[PDB]
């Protein structure tokens, strides 16, 4: 109900202030209220919120200037401690996959670079953008890997190995 | 330094109830 609106505008983003203006200030509100919760609120809302915030972050994959990425990830760090083993893993794989595809598309520019100054500046800007996305997404993955790793070790999973391959 | 500031002790006259204390302490 309250969080049902958030999933509505998960698609068609590409802006940190134009369409999601109140979102930037309201996401930490429930992101801190839900962990605090006659009682025993189900964790399906938590998993849906984590998936929605991951989708919102990956929507702005190629934004030029974006600072909310470095803050939303910090705010959502306590929210991934209680996460579903499979609901989030269906969202983490496509996001990191697209990130690796962007990295592969951008390494080719530096490979073909070897005029020079402009190309160096362009690849430096692209690498800075990629680093910003990396530091916005990886912290939400390190915590999700700290847990659910004993499960992935005792019972091997194909998706875990695929994620390892992409990270490597 | 420690400039002395003695307290007045030669003006008060001891009572008769303390002479026994003085003598007994001296003997002790």
């Amino acid at each position: 109900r309250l969080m049902a609106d958030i999933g509505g505008l998960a698609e068609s983003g590409a802006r940190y202030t134009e369409m999601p203006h109140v979102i930037e200030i309201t996401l930490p509100m429930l992101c801190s209220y839900l962990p605090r919760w006659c009682t025993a609120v189900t964790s399906d809302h938590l998993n849906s919120l984590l998936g929605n915030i991951l989708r919102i972050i990956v929507n702005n994959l190629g934004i030029d200037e974006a600072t909310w990425m470095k803050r939303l990830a910090v705010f959502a760090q306590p929210i991934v401690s209680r996460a579903r083993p499979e609901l989030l893993h269906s969202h983490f794989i496509p996001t990191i996959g697209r990130l690796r595809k962007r990295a592969g598309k951008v390494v080719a520019e530096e490979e073909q670079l070897r005029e020079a100054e402009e190309g160096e500046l362009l690849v430096r800007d692209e690498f800075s953008v990629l680093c910003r996305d990396l530091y916005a997404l990886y912290p939400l993955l390190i915590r999700y890997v700290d847990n659910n790793r004993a499960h992935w070790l005792t019972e091997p999973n194909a998706n875990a190995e695929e994620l390892f391959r992409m990270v490597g | 330094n420690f400039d002395p500031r003695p307290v007045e002790t030669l003006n008060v006259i001891i009572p008769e109830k303390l002479d026994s204390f003085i003598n007994k302490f001296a003997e002790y």
Binding site: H21, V22, E24, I25, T26, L27, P28, M29, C31, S32, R36, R71, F75 | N1, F2, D3, P4, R5, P6, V7, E8, T9, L10, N11, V12, I14, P15, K17, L18, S20, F21, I22, K24, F25, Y28
Partner: protein, 317 residues
């Protein structure tokens, strides 16, 4: 002279009991000592050193000059040095006890029950009148004191005493939060009176708010200063709500509280949430402020560059 000085020191002597070649010394090691008698013993032992140094003054006058390590005040003396001076005074207190003489004149009250925190609070109480004078002349000497010495002093003392002073003192808990209240009230709606000389007032407020010993005691007490905390919270909520007349409409005396009051509110909310103090934190003189602050956050739940600060405050609350 040892007894004459005690008599002249306005102390009553009353007979309570009856005094109980190889000499036969009676045993005197079976008598304990009291804290009150310790001061009497020290003062009596001071007399011997005083009457010795008084003659040593004439002796050194005859000598013509010289420094001796033994000519020091008795408060400087240590038990190692007292081992040659405390015996002559201790041998007579047991004698007095067994003879039958009586001398009449918790330890927290005698000791520093107020402590450094309450000493700083008294300094701030004087600084209240000092700040009143400063505001009257604003609308000379204590201003430099406040901006130089005491503000870093508290900013460091609260940092070094955040632990062990919040969970084992009780009286200081009810007054550290109150000190935080007058500290918040000291800065007016503007910060120009303090000027750029002392921007550390905001940091000191941060540190004091982050160290609130009476997290639940201030709400579970008889609520003497809880009215002050309620007033501070209501003033903060009203100041926040007054921003809708500037940000949502179009400046002066209100933008200064977005850099000196909102971070303090975030720090206080984080302090409350960190220890899960929500068991008893909204009690008498607090619900009257929470019922208004929920409406306030509802009002400014729909509001340029101040968005991250508002989001952080909402997350903390």
């Amino acid at each position: 002279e040892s007894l004459k000085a005690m008599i002249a020191w306005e102390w009553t002597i009353e007979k309570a009991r009856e005094g109980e070649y190889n000499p036969q010394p009676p045993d005197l090691s079976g008598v304990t000592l009291s804290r009150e008698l310790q001061a009497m013993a020290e003062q009596l032992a001071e007399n011997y050193h005083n009457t010795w140094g008084r003659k040593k003054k004439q002796e050194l006058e005859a000598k013509g000059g010289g420094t001796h390590p033994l000519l020091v005040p008795y408060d400087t003396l240590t038990a190692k040095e007292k081992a040659r001076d405390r015996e002559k005074a201790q041998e007579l207190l047991k004698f007095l006890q067994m003879n039958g003489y009586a001398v009449t004149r918790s330890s927290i009250e005698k000791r520093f029950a107020f402590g450094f925190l309450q000493q700083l609070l008294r300094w701030m109480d004087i600084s209240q009148e000092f700040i009143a004078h400063l505001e009257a002349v604003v609308s000379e000497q204590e201003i430099k004191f406040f901006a130089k010495i005491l503000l870093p002093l508290i900013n460091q003392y609260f940092t070094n005493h955040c632990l062990y002073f919040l969970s084992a003192s009780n009286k200081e808990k009810e007054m550290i939060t109150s000190l935080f209240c007058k500290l918040a009230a000291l800065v007016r709606h503007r910060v120009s009176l303090f000027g750029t000389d002392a921007p550390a007032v905001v940091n000191c407020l941060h540190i004091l708010a982050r160290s609130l010993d009476a997290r639940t005691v201030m709400k579970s007490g008889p609520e003497i200063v809880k009215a002050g905390l309620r007033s501070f919270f209501e003033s903060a909520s009203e100041d926040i709500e007054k921003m809708v007349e500037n940000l949502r409409l179009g400046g002066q005396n209100l933008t200064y509280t977005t850099v000196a009051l909102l971070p303090v509110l975030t720090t206080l909310f984080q302090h409350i949430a960190q220890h899960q103090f929500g068991d008893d934190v909204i009690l008498d003189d607090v619900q009257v402020s929470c019922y208004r602050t929920l409406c306030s956050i509802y009002s400014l739940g729909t509001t340029e560059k101040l968005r991250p600060a508002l989001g952080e405050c909402l997350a903390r609350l």
